[PDB]
Amino acid sequence: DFRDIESKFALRTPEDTAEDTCHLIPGVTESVANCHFNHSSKTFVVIHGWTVTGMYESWVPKLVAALYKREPDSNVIVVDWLSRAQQHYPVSAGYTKLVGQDVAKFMNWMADEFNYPLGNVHLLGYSLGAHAAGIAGSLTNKKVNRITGLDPAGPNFEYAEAPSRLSPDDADFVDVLHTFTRGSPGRSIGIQKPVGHVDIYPNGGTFQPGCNIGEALRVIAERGLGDVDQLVKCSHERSVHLFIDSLLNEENPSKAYRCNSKEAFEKGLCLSCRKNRCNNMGYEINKVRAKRSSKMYLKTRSQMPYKVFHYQVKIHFSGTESNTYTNQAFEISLYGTVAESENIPFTLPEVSTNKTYSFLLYTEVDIGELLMLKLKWISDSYFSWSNWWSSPGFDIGKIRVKAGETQKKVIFCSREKMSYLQKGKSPVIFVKCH
Amino acid sequence: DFRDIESKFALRTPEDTAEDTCHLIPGVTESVANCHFNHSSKTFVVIHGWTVTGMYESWVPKLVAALYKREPDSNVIVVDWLSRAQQHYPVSAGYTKLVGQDVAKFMNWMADEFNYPLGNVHLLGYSLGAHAAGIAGSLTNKKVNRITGLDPAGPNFEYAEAPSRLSPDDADFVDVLHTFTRGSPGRSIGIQKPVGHVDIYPNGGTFQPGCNIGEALRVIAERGLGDVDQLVKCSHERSVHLFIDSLLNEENPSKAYRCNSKEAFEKGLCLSCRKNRCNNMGYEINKVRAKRSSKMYLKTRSQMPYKVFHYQVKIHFSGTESNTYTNQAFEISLYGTVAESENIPFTLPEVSTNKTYSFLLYTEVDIGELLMLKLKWISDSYFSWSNWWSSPGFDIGKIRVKAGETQKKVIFCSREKMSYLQKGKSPVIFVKCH
């Protein structure tokens, strides 16, 4: 009952992270002895996804190299979607079931011949591979510890059920990286419905910064003609790049936050995590169970380090003139004890008086503590036309910034009288106080 | 069908040649992965024998260490005769069948699960272990390459057949070290009937030199009370010591010779090996098949290096006085181009005239070539009583020594007139000639 495999399982090593050297044929125990397999250590399983070409994508070598870097003396298994994924995309959607059955048979054979503990295997799933793993494991008798996927496919999986798509019950623990969701429901490539016990929605899933418009023209540019095809795939690989970055930087994991909605997170009222919230993201994620879908949010840098901070702010606006204004740009800057940002902007419409506001700010440099603050208010009338005549202004009292990683209700504090924030004027300084 | 084993198979490593660390349980494939087992390389199987104590004899560690020294990256398996061999000796003779069945089941299971090539395993057998292996393998479907044993047991195996004792058909190739045969037929511990394709009878099997009388008294000495028990076991371990010495000294193996009988070899008429005779002894033995039992003979040093030479000699005695003498001692010495022996004696009765004689000589030092010779003739009348009056004497012409390892019919050559060998007289010099 091991003749309908048609999907070769490879086993690379740190010295060779490019070419598949081994072939762990199910049933034929000879391969296990042929290629060293530490039955005591943990063993990952990478499941790549659809590829227009006839070869592995460019990210697998880096992923596997980083995996060995993080956890040496641990086996790695790769699959051979090729010969089946090259077919029409819906055909791959159908063949997900066959590959899942194949992987389940593989794991069952391993647990029968070698009784390898199932609690030491990850089904790293990308693109269609995540759904493939999800449909897999469920057939396994002893379940699976981790089924962490990457950018689960949306088409032909929304409006579905657990047997036909990744489900929380498919494994003991699960987490997904919703790195792309822009578009109408049920048609965006990236599924938006939460699937795992904990889900991550970096940047809100609308898009990612480390890219540009991309395709200049159908013929002049390269839609899938290499070149700018990768640029077109702005976010679909950002999941794997984020995962590998987190794996490499184990010392300082990025702390994704738990909230209620993307707009709520943007406002910044849902950052404090006294309970089991705001868990880590990546390999060092904390294993936790939830009574329901638990959305999360965070931000990131462009490409290389990621790992940004979060310093949401509140303002107790209280002035004299009561003419409400809307759609105004606020610019602030902060200085600390390690480094300092200079000209970070942000937006806050519907400004009023005798009212308190709040917003979310992010920086991409470590600052540690924070001493003083800048609160410049920008205008489109730089020249001396609007430098004398009375322009709208407000008064600033206290400021209640809250550090993200460490809960610090530091109370910033306007000076005795030297604030009077005004349009087209120098910022207002603040200091630690109280 | 793997619950009646009751004989644990161990697997030592070069770093641990004393204590069994692993347990390759048949059927349970987990042990193979637990303990590294290079399925490509050769794998020996040591089968020790009866022991009055409840632990492995003192030679197993040295044997296994030397085995690793000779062939690194090669697995070694040890058996656990203990718990069954401690019983009465005949009970062990009966249990040989059970252990053989167990080993056959082990090997068959290996050839089924891992299809390990049977042509890369040795069943190193000692004492009862040799017969155990011989009864083993025969049940194996794919036969065995080498079944080299050591000092096969004699009792309850003479007057037997192949199924109940080691046989040439039990494996592809076989060789035994008949290191002890003194005693009546069918009662000497060491079987004297040839068994394998090629058999080795060092020193003729009567005894070995590296020992003494041993047991001084039943109570005062230590029959089996340790101490002189090893001395009593003068030859039974000489087999394994010879094997380990040959294994360690791979560069210069000892060349055992093929002959017709021990007396014929002692005479020295059966050393030349133009055909496939005089094969090596030990690991570097040349694999050969014979139409029948092929006895062999050789000599050895005391304990450490072994590896002695063979320089049989012929004498063309031709003198005037025709009074035959008998039971006389001849002393000779030789000098070469590397080293030289000084006072090696030998015996030759039934000395006559106009007749040619021959004998076998051995030396324990490398000599390479040989230049001159000594032919002193000893007497028990050293003093000047027999120094003047005419004592019996002969004349010497040519000498036809023959080098063993290299066939060299070097013709020694008496001087013009200066020979006249006489009793109680200075030797007669000889040189290379012709």
Swiss-Prot record, chains A, B:
Q: Which InterPro entries match?
A: AB_hydrolase_fold (IPR029058), Lipase (IPR013818), Lipase_LIPH (IPR016272), Lipase_N (IPR033906), Lipo_Lipase (IPR002330), PLAT/LH2_dom (IPR001024), PLAT/LH2_dom_sf (IPR036392), TAG_lipase (IPR000734)
Q: In which tissues is it expressed?
A: Detected in milk (at protein level).
Does the record carry Hydrolase as a key word?
Answer: yes
This protein is called Lipoprotein lipase
KW tRNA-binding (keyword) present: no
Pfam families in the record = Lipase, PLAT
Region ranges (Important for interaction with lipoprotein particles): 385-389
Q: What are the residue boundaries of the PLAT domain, all occurrences included?
A: 309-432
- Any idea of its EC number? 3.1.1.34, 3.1.1.32
Region annotation (Important for heparin binding) ranges: 398-402
Q: Known post-translational modifications? A: Tyrosine nitration after lipopolysaccharide (LPS) challenge down-regulates the lipase activity.
Q: Which stretches of sequence are listed as region Interaction with GPIHBP1?
A: 1-21, 411-434
Q: Which SMART domains match?
A: LH2
Q: How does the record say this protein sits in the membrane?
A: Peripheral membrane protein
GO terms of molecular function:
apolipoprotein binding; calcium ion binding; heparan sulfate proteoglycan binding; heparin binding; lipoprotein lipase activity; lipoprotein particle binding; phospholipase A1 activity; phospholipase activity
